[PDB]
């Protein structure tokens, strides 16, 4: 798994690799109310549940 801060991987005598996440959603911030909730939930799961 890749955390927000990124992951470093090394194998054998080779050089390390670095990976960072990028934002992606299936919902939308525009349109019907129930589609808006999905958009934010996929990005900040913990805060979305507590606030609602």
């Amino acid at each position: 798994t890749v955390p927000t801060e990124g992951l470093e991987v090394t194998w054998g005598n080779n050089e390390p690799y670095k990976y960072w996440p990028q934002m992606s959603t299936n919902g939308t911030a525009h349109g019907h109310p129930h589609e808006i909730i999905l958009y934010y939930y996929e990005l900040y799961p913990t805060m979305t549940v507590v606030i609602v």
């Binding site: 990976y19 990028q22 934002m23 525009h30």
Partner: protein, 439 residues
Amino acid sequence: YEHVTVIPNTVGVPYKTLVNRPGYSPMVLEMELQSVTLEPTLSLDYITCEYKTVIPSPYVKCCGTAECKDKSLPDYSCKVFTGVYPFMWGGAYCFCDAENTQLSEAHVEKSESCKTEFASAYRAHTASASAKLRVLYQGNNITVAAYANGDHAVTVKDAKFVVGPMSSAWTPFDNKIVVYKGDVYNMDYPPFGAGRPGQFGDIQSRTPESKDVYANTQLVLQRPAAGTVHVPYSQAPSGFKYWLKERGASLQHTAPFGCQIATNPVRAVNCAVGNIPISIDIPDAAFTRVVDAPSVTDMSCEVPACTHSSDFGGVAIIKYTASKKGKCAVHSMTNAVTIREADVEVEGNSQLQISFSTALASAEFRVQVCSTQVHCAAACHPPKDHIVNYPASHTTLGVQDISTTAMSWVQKITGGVGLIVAVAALILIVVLCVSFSRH
């Protein structure tokens, strides 16, 4: 003219700052840093290495009694055995068949190999810091290097730069470290004169040139076998050889914050902590009066596309009319949007293009070109790429940064509930007042 700014300690990311003074044209500078190094102060306690055992030829006295005296050599041992009857290839050695004795002795010395294969123990103290910086100034790339404190200044093209001090005192090294051929380990080594027979520190010396050596190995002499001339003994194995096979991973692989380690001298680089202030001094001759600079009088903005990805996924078109040929500086007036371009060339009546990146779902910002401003707005869509190989070029969002549609829904729901409460309160007040007054 003095200017002060603060840049975060993020290697490989450019930042921009705006400098201006009333009556003169503004300037925009761009800065990017390449390396940061910390260096501790060390002191030596002792070194360790392998040991050697020295055993001379035994002395055998038949039909007489041997004795020996004490000596000051390290781990000296001496014993006398009775009842020996040695043989050689040609027959029994001495005429007497009884009352024979044998004398054995040994001691411990320091190995010759200690000049090449050894480890050293250090104590660590407060570290210094330095940095290397790149600056884009008046269309030219220049480089500077300075100490990360207030006691150094560098002058390039008649401008002075001062960097530091650093905002954080975090250091990846502990008080006690051990160094061996490029590896650095954190280990609470025992004090001088308190070693153990089979662990690290069984033999200690202050310096490779010393003659005084400490050791606390076990050494016991044993009875010889019948008919054989030899000196058996029992001794604990060397601790140094054991450590090499069990020492584990070094700090290069376990340290936090992505730090890297070097040993000649001991250093740590690229630790992503804190921020660094900078101060700049620009001479008066570098400024041009606004009466000579070009001007732009009429502008409008449109933004045909926006994707809020980690890269520059936005484009904008700006219309202008300019008074004469020349150059202008470009700068953003908000923190949530970064613009790649430093300057533009303007002539006549035409349009210019810029690119930007942002994390906002709905973006509004202002842009300044040659001391005048416009307002731009657009809606942005999400990307579809899960993983990338580079850090983002923009800042994070806050709790207030929500879309306009979401805000509208919030106001409607809150207002509805508030209204029904107010109506109920008004009914109670009239009833309570009338009942009081009617009596």
